Amino acid sequence: IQDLRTLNQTWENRVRELRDLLTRYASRREDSMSLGARDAELYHLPVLEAVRKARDAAPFRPLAVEDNRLVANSFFSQFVPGTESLERFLTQLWENEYFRTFRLRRLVTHQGAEEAIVYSNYTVERVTLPYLCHILALGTLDPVPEAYL
Amino acid sequence: GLCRHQKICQLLNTFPVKVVTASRHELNCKKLVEMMEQHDAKKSIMKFLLNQVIKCLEEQIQSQVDEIQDLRTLNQTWENRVRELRDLLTRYASRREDSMSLGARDAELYHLPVLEAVRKARDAAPFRPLAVEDNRLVANSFFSQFVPGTESLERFLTQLWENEYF
Amino acid sequence: GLCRHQKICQLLNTFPVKVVTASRHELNCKKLVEMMAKKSIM
Amino acid sequence: KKVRSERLEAQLRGKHIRLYVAAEPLAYERDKLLFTTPVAHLHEEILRYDGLCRHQKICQLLNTFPVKVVTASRHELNCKKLVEMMEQHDAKKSIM
Amino acid sequence: AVRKARDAAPFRPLAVEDNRLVANSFFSQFVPGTESLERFLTQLWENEYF
Amino acid sequence: IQDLRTLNQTWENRVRELRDLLTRYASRREDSMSLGARDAELYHLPVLE
DSSP states (O other): OHHHHHHHHHHHHHHHHHHHHHOOHHHHHTTOSOOHHHHHHHHHSOHHHHHHHHHHHSOOOOEEOOOSSOOOEEEEOOOOOOTTTTHHHHHHHHTTTHHHHSOOEEEEOGGGOEEEEEOOSSHIIIIIHHHHHTTSOOSSOOOOOTTTO | OOHHHHHHHHHTTOSSEEEEEOOOSOOHHHHHHHHHHHHOOHHHHHHHHHOOHHHHHHHHHHHHHHHHHHHHHHHHHHHHHHHHHHHHHHHHHHHHHSOOOOHHHHHHHHHSOHHHHHHHHHHHSOOOOEEOOOSSOOOOOOOOOOOOOTTTTHHHHHHHHHHHHO | OOHHHHHHHHHTTOSSOOEEEEOOOTTTTHHHHHHOOHHHHO | OBTTTTBOOOEETTEEOOOOOSSOOEEETTTEEEOOSHHHHSHHHHHHHHHHHHHHHHHHHTTOSSOOOOOOOOSOOHHHHHHHHHHHHOOHHHHO | OHHHHHHHSOOOOOOOOOSSOEEEEOOOOOOOOTTTTHHHHHHHHHHHHO | OHHHHHHHHHHHHHHHHHHHHHOOHHHHHTTOSOOHHHHHHHHHSOSOO
16 A cells, blocks of 8 residues: 555656646746837846846756666757858858959058949949940940049 | 768757667566566455454454555556556657748747747757667767868868969 | 858757756665565465 | 739828839739848848847846756655654553 | 845746656856857948948 | 566567667668758758758
8 A cells, every 4th residue: 555655646746747848838828928128128127027037938948758767878069150250251252253253443542441342444344335235225335434433 | 072061060969968868678667567466365365264353353454455445546546647648748749749830930030039939949959869779788978079170171272263273 | 051050059058057857766666566475374 | 012013102191192213122923022222131130130139138147046956856755654654653552 | 235135136946846856967158149240240231331 | 487588588679789780771771862952952941850
């Protein structure tokens, strides 16, 4: 009787734990109030209230899988990817592509500071003049020099 | 061959907590249940019976039997509740396996609040452990956070293209 | 394809303290049953 | 924006009103527009920026308590059982 | 202030009762680097209006 | 009988473990679909699948 009662208690505890793990409805109904303006309000109202709200706004949800045996050897992987290292490759890809297709002139001053970037004499011939020869009127208009542009 | 190696190595360690679990060949609980059921004797007691203090002893035995019956009924009810809970959890697992409803939602994740995103992020990458059942379960493990340095040799290839066309 | 990986990689580890549990005392109970005839008495 | 005999109109108070095009959209396949404006060029990433700014605040915010611990309760309430036992023991009839 | 700080953020633990209580834990102090990509967006705005 | 049954169970477990370790055919038939374009598609479609 003592062992059966203990087993029943264990089973009840197991059922409660399983129910807590499975059911997420309570969480779904919770935090409905939270929206963008409350987030701004966090800064506006006391920080401590916000901290308490955050504490219960992202609840401690464990992770578990039933196994026949109590075997578990664990590791952790903190990670980010380096998005900055190849953004400055794609930005310097676009600029190193469009300055080879259409060869746009840059105006640089002392201590190498780049200023605004103008059309060449080549690209106006390469993209605007074919817009003039088959899309617009042909055979009368002359192309502008680069500095005059 | 290194760019997609770069992506397969960042990609397969995205789940931040991995654990390896194994099952031994010692199903003591099942055997114990079988044992207790097997024990549940009566014929010998009946034979002995057929063949003040005696009345009190008989009454005590009857009370004990009643208590045992009550315990058995409670255990059966507990077992039924446990089975129902297990079935519900098992069904919930199938729903859990399918994760992260739409592609658009990922863009939407930026728009919606972070707490909601975190909640969706829990079941969006469910806890899928990596495990192999063993017969002989001695383990000795390791972990290697890794990326390959694809920047240092791209900045070589693009300083190869310029020094090969010139 | 890396920037939304970058954000989802930041997203799934925001909760600072993580822990995992497994079933325990599968057989612990069984010890009492094991420790706890009629034919010999008959 | 009219899809049937397509045009760009403007409305106010339930009345028509003059408008003009200066950065007109790439009207394409079905029921969708694309805009060459500078803001739509950085619309997604500035939504990403607020999606990281409040991510920045929810991650500093939830680990402010400096000492965290996890506690659990086992199913071995020995003390309660012991109290019940001792009470049950508290024999006298046999002595009498 | 310290005295008020003790009860102003009371010791609220994080715990889940278990039936089967084997635990294996971790901790991750974390921030995201919002500076490195704000200084990208503001060097995007100047390079998108020019 | 109890010990022999346990031994038989252990042997069966050992055989299953050995079979899982050895056999790679399932893996070979698996992942046939994967190719260069799917790899590009990974970036194109959602990251999680």
